[model samples]
Target: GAMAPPVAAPSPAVTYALQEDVFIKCNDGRFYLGTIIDQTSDQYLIRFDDQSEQWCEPDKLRKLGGGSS
Candidate 1:
């Protein structure tokens, strides 16, 4: 059986840095978007969201709620 994950406070931001290990979910809150593994240029290279093999600079990120947690 798949136990549901405990819901945390409403995520104020969708996009966040995977400094070490992180759980990234968009505001809609169902997807395990991605994991941060390495750095590409100045942005963190996450391996789940968008399935992109590149990095998104902090300023160019589409934050989930336009706010930081």
Candidate 2:
């Protein structure tokens, strides 16, 4: 009977956390594979396979189509 209060869940768009894999829409209008290295209040830092990284918005991020564990 003494369980602590649980925190409210955040938006589904930002469900990706550190090291999570996702597809981010780039300026070229294509989705690329990326890893979530960091995130701010409204942006996620994505690291690509080319060793390139960028700060992306939640609207531009999507989960892997094949499903992630």
Candidate 3:
């Protein structure tokens, strides 16, 4: 009998900083200005420029380049 190699589960991704501004590309392909107001174990709450709030998955977001804090 052959033994199988053990596999490990990948860790959840997290990169953006909390309570700061970041650029998020919407599901419709438009980028919006937002700030990460809060976070949970696996998601962040983002407040958009329009003052609308949404929960975002970390993997679905990207860091902005214009040096917003």
Candidate 4:
């Protein structure tokens, strides 16, 4: 019963690359450094530069000006 969607969901303008460098929005109204690591139907899993990992939903993150692989 693992049949998934035939096409990718979500908005294109609000997309992030897998394993790409990005900024996270959590506290203090700041953008923290992190990288997109994994994803699910509604959220993504990313880890901080300090080796700390966090789960963030879409819109909770932003891309780097000069993204990475």
Candidate 5:
């Protein structure tokens, strides 16, 4: 008799690093700055300049370039 082992599935979501600053586009064609504070399997919690936090998707954010503020 033989026993079979279960396989783990890989997640399709992209992971983000903590304390990484990034910019995201809004519906009004404006870009807002935020920092990565937390993360889950499919989303990241970002802290904005106004001290507000939100959960965002990986594809909706862009890395901030140096001296581009």
Candidate 6:
């Protein structure tokens, strides 16, 4: 089968400050962002940067520069 069309990478000019909420994509294909709830040995626990304190894993994230998920 042919590969899907290339995706336009996110902007690289954007940088996140500490405690800033960043939209990240999980391996399971979902979007969430908030404060970093906890820092794991490998990945940090991110709380959705919204009114709701939802949590996520850093290893499951991709930032503007193609994050470390």
Report lDDT (CA) for all predictions: 0.45, 0.70, 0.65, 0.66, 0.64, 0.48
Give lDDT tens digits, candidate 1, residues 1-69: 012223433322234555443434444554444556775444656666565544533333344444453
Alpha carbon lDDT of residue 48, candidate 1?
A: 68
The alpha-carbon lDDT assigned to residue 32 of candidate 1 equals: 49
TM-score of 2: 0.69
- lDDT for model 4, please: 0.66
Q: In model 3, where do residues sit more than 4 Å from their true spots? A: 1-12, 65-69
Best-to-worst TM-score order: 2, 4, 3, 5, 6, 1
For model 1, how big is the CA root-mean-square deviation?
12.0
Which is the better candidate, 4 or 6, if ranked by lDDT?
4
Best-to-worst order by lDDT is 2, 4, 3, 5, 6, 1
| Candidate 6 TM-score, C-alpha based | 0.40
TM-score of each prediction: 0.32, 0.69, 0.63, 0.64, 0.63, 0.40
- Ten contiguous residues with the weakest lDDT in model 5: 1-10
- On the 0 to 100 scale, the lDDT of residue 27 in model 3 is 71
Point to the candidate with the largest TM-score: 2
lDDT of prediction 5: 0.64
- Top of the candidates by lDDT: 2
> What range of 10 consecutive residues in model 3 has the weakest lDDT sum?
1-10
Total clashes in model 6, counting residue pairs 3 or more apart in sequence or in different chains? 5
lDDT of 6 by residue, 1-69 (tens): 012212354323322344655676655677776555555344445666455653344434446445444
**In candidate 6, where is summed lDDT lowest over 10 consecutive residues?**
1-10
For model 1, give the 10-residue run with minimal summed lDDT. Answer: 1-10
